[PDB]
Symmetry: D3
Subunit: 175 residues, 6 copies
Amino acid sequence: SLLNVPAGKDLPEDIYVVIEIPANADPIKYEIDKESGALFVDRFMSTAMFYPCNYGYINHTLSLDGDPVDVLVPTPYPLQPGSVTRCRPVGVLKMTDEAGEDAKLVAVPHSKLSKEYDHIKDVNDLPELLKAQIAHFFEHYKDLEKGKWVKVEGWENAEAAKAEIVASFERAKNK
Amino acid sequence: SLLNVPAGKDLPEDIYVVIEIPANADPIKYEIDKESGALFVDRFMSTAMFYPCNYGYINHTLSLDGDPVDVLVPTPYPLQPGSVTRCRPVGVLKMTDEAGEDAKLVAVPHSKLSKEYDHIKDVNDLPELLKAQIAHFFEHYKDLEKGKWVKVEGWENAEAAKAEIVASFERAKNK
Amino acid sequence: SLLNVPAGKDLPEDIYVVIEIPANADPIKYEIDKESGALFVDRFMSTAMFYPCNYGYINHTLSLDGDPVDVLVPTPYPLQPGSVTRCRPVGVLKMTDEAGEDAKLVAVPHSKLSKEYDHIKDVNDLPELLKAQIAHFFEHYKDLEKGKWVKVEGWENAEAAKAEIVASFERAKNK
Amino acid sequence: SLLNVPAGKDLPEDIYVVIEIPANADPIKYEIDKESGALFVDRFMSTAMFYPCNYGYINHTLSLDGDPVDVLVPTPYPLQPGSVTRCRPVGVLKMTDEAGEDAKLVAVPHSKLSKEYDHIKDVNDLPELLKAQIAHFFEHYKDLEKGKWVKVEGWENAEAAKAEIVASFERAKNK
Amino acid sequence: SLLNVPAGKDLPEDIYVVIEIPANADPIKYEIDKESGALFVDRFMSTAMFYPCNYGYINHTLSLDGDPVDVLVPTPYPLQPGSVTRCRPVGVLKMTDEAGEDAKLVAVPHSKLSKEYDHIKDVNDLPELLKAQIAHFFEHYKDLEKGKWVKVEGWENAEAAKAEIVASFERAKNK
Amino acid sequence: SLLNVPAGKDLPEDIYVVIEIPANADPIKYEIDKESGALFVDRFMSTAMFYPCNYGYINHTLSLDGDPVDVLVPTPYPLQPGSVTRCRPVGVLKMTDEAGEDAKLVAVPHSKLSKEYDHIKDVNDLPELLKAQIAHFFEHYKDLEKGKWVKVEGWENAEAAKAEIVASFERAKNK
Ligand SMILES: [Ca+2]
Ligand SMILES: [Ca+2]
Ligand SMILES: [Ca+2]
Ligand SMILES: [Ca+2]
Ligand SMILES: [Ca+2]
Ligand SMILES: [Ca+2]
Ligand SMILES: [Ca+2]
Ligand SMILES: [Ca+2]
Ligand SMILES: [Ca+2]
Ligand SMILES: [Ca+2]
Ligand SMILES: [Ca+2]
Ligand SMILES: [Ca+2]
Ligand SMILES: [Ca+2]
Ligand SMILES: [Ca+2]
Ligand SMILES: [Ca+2]
Ligand SMILES: [Ca+2]
Ligand SMILES: [Ca+2]
Ligand SMILES: [Ca+2]
Ligand SMILES: [Ca+2]
Ligand SMILES: [Ca+2]
Ligand SMILES: [Ca+2]
Ligand SMILES: [Ca+2]
Ligand SMILES: [Ca+2]
Ligand SMILES: [Ca+2]
Ligand SMILES: [Ca+2]
Ligand SMILES: [Ca+2]
Ligand SMILES: [Ca+2]
Ligand SMILES: [Ca+2]
Ligand SMILES: [Ca+2]
Ligand SMILES: [Ca+2]
Ligand SMILES: [Cl-]
Ligand SMILES: [Cl-]
Ligand SMILES: [Cl-]
Ligand SMILES: [Cl-]
Ligand SMILES: [Cl-]
Ligand SMILES: [Cl-]
Ligand SMILES: [Cl-]
Ligand SMILES: [Cl-]
Ligand SMILES: [Cl-]
Ligand SMILES: [Cl-]
Ligand SMILES: [Cl-]
Ligand SMILES: [Cl-]
Ligand SMILES: [Cl-]
Ligand SMILES: [Cl-]
Ligand SMILES: [Cl-]
Ligand SMILES: [Cl-]
Ligand SMILES: [Cl-]
Ligand SMILES: [Cl-]
Ligand code: NA
Ligand code: NA
Ligand code: NA
Ligand code: NA
Ligand code: NA
Ligand code: NA
């Protein structure tokens, strides 16, 4: 099932991301259920916003927030919910929510899937417009949901992203 | 797998529906296979009709027709086949087919997913147009399939819907 | 051409809206060009937001901002850019932008097109979620465009909407 | 504008059809307005049905019902509303509605656009499933609209279709 | 899971195909992973081409190339990735790639799903345009991927397709 | 109508392109008719290929092939057929077809529509993958259409593109 997919072929540079929400999609927040492996509806979003990239997680990781590491994956065409993509981390957006710190990584399709993103090596290589759009999304998408809130802090580099992956992989392994 | 998803967090008011057919979709009737959990094509429909809401079933239920309880779920945007949505029953359409009685429940997204449908408490609160469209769909979608037929009987209330859920949950539990 | 379509069969209660941007669409702001009648791209929006309803204008009207009256039209399914829909005003959102006051009307499909929206008679009958989503959209969609900004003021009723239509129709007639 | 497009390069075998409603579309009945050339919404259909082929009319024709000849055009992919396709008539479905007789022609893409439909020479060459789906659509799509109704009579051949085209072209020419 | 679906109810005439890539889709080559049953991205294709039919495989088969038998399934509407369709083989396209011979079967929806394809009994009954489009796709889709290449050889009949199914089913059974 | 749209606000650097075919679309080749301004179907393409960018022309230009200048416009989201986009030329692909030389320009959305493409100043700044995909498309899309053929020659720079625009604008002006 999706529950058995590796974290990656060679973490932290070569990872797999399980997609929950496609790019360019309707505002339905899906989440894989840890017990069943099934895709559940978490929310029908109240804001007229959409996730700016495909969105999902790295299996077999455990962040300090109790969930697997969250990742945004830009692609040329939107991915299927429940599919798995090989990727390479390039940066991370830090933010604070009602529960504490959080982080949203950005990882690009691995070179074996396409050469398209090979030129993006670190966070400064992501388009400025894309980074601004991502920050604005996380800052505002919960504006109409009482109880949940997000304050965006700022971007960090690929080494910071990779550190989150390794820390969270080792935490899961040792759980 | 989808085979392991609960009937609901607190039946009959708080249920899960496993979606087989999205709203606003092409006329492909999908059904989850009980053995494998996979989504199979049942039919490429002959009529130029579409399911009027997302359509699926309540897992771990057994109706007198030998299948899990059938449910229609209105949503703001169409759901993914194979996804699971938390919902609240509000009414039921009774009908007769080539095999006997049947029923098609209507359940709305649970308040935790969105406040949108909180105002729909019972069958009289569903829009008249939606109810008429649903009845017309079930009356006619099999008009060109020899062997299968449906005669729509009429709507009943949320208590009737809830009774079907409980009866069919207890039948499954006791199988 | 679109340039020759009436303001309405019986203003201000029975109007036509020329659609520029569909509901549930990609974030491309289109505008009809007054000279040619053609649909031009105004902007590829920087924010990950979408217009919450179909959006367009009432032909043969002139508001104090120099443009025809702006209208949002909820529909069951998204409309085609460049199409024309008969509608009935129900409310108006007032706002301030870099140039001055503005207003975004809401008008629902006319009863002759469908009975669906007949129950919405005034602004209090629009769903609260929809109104909040609309306000949030206009408050934030220009957050990443330097030079353009919007501060949302608040909703007014169908009589206020109708007054804007009549004032702007008479201004155009007298230009 | 669309108002100036010919009936055809060589009627009745080689015609142009102005498309109003795409195949595989949402249930929005569009109609071109004779005065403006603009695409208007006629109806948001109440039934959960869709037009089985692209649907439109032959310009510069006048049938006994006061409108241009109505035509269904099967294509491999859905057409744009307002576009024009070169086609060849192959058959006609006769029907009675609240106003009198009507007819819905079927015309296939001309050989110059594609060889795909060259094998369909007459009404017996259309797939049986397609013909049944078309008849069922026209029989039922107005089932929930009070005031409008349709009783389907039966299919006739390409010569019958061609006769309707010629009669209606000559009626328009002589208006 | 998808891993447990039969090869077919009555091979080689009555088979199941697990769909990986829908018809009319974006150029994302998906493949089910043998270990997990999950849908992985194999490639973001470099060419502006799309798979001409739905594409997938027959479970519990093993061809000489080490993978299950590959099958193209024409349908009236595109299928969901990960869904399963009952079908009937009608022909096979032979080709050579960087690793050796290959074959791409064509199988049509089984009569129980629809009567639409019952008239296609053998390879000569497939439309010429469809066969040419399929051959051209496989000849060119890898033109921009270094390392992978395809030279199309030619079509063979339903008996040849059926022989591949049986040989590959027996090879798997005996592994 | 579309017939009255300028070539551009300040040719050759600041042009308008009238879109005929969206990005990421079905394989339907549309062309605006010079007489009517309407969008006609030219071809239902036989190959399983799609135009790699939005495609259209510069109005009020006349190339040596008798038609307005042809332009590809990359955008973040596909454009509407018949819409008009302000753009800036960056390069040109030269090719030979059954009638003689041809050229396909590439122009990016103007800075006023978005900052996204400001970094693309000349042909070397276009992604290599995109350029290869475009060349491969034009080399192969007519492979199954008898009578029409294309041999791709190679790319030239923004000055070459601009020269084509000016030459063809002056030819039209002087017709
Ligand atoms: Ca979308
Ligand atoms: Ca998560
Ligand atoms: Ca969080
Ligand atoms: Ca997290
Ligand atoms: Ca915030
Ligand atoms: Ca649909
Ligand atoms: Ca069922
Ligand atoms: Ca039944
Ligand atoms: Ca049942
Ligand atoms: Ca019936
Ligand atoms: Ca959308
Ligand atoms: Ca405006
Ligand atoms: Ca303004
Ligand atoms: Ca205004
Ligand atoms: Ca603001
Ligand atoms: Ca559709
Ligand atoms: Ca008509
Ligand atoms: Ca009629
Ligand atoms: Ca008629
Ligand atoms: Ca009838
Ligand atoms: Ca497509
Ligand atoms: Ca395979
Ligand atoms: Ca191979
Ligand atoms: Ca193979
Ligand atoms: Ca080759
Ligand atoms: Ca597409
Ligand atoms: Ca051209
Ligand atoms: Ca040419
Ligand atoms: Ca040219
Ligand atoms: Ca060539
Ligand atoms: Cl792992
Ligand atoms: Cl993306
Ligand atoms: Cl990589
Ligand atoms: Cl349970
Ligand atoms: Cl729905
Ligand atoms: Cl609830
Ligand atoms: Cl007027
Ligand atoms: Cl809407
Ligand atoms: Cl009204
Ligand atoms: Cl004419
Ligand atoms: Cl069609
Ligand atoms: Cl022909
Ligand atoms: Cl088996
Ligand atoms: Cl297909
Ligand atoms: Cl069969
Ligand atoms: Cl000009
Ligand atoms: Cl593009
Ligand atoms: Cl510019
Ligand atoms: Na909030
Ligand atoms: Na039947
Ligand atoms: Na701004
Ligand atoms: Na009726
Ligand atoms: Na290659
Ligand atoms: Na050719």
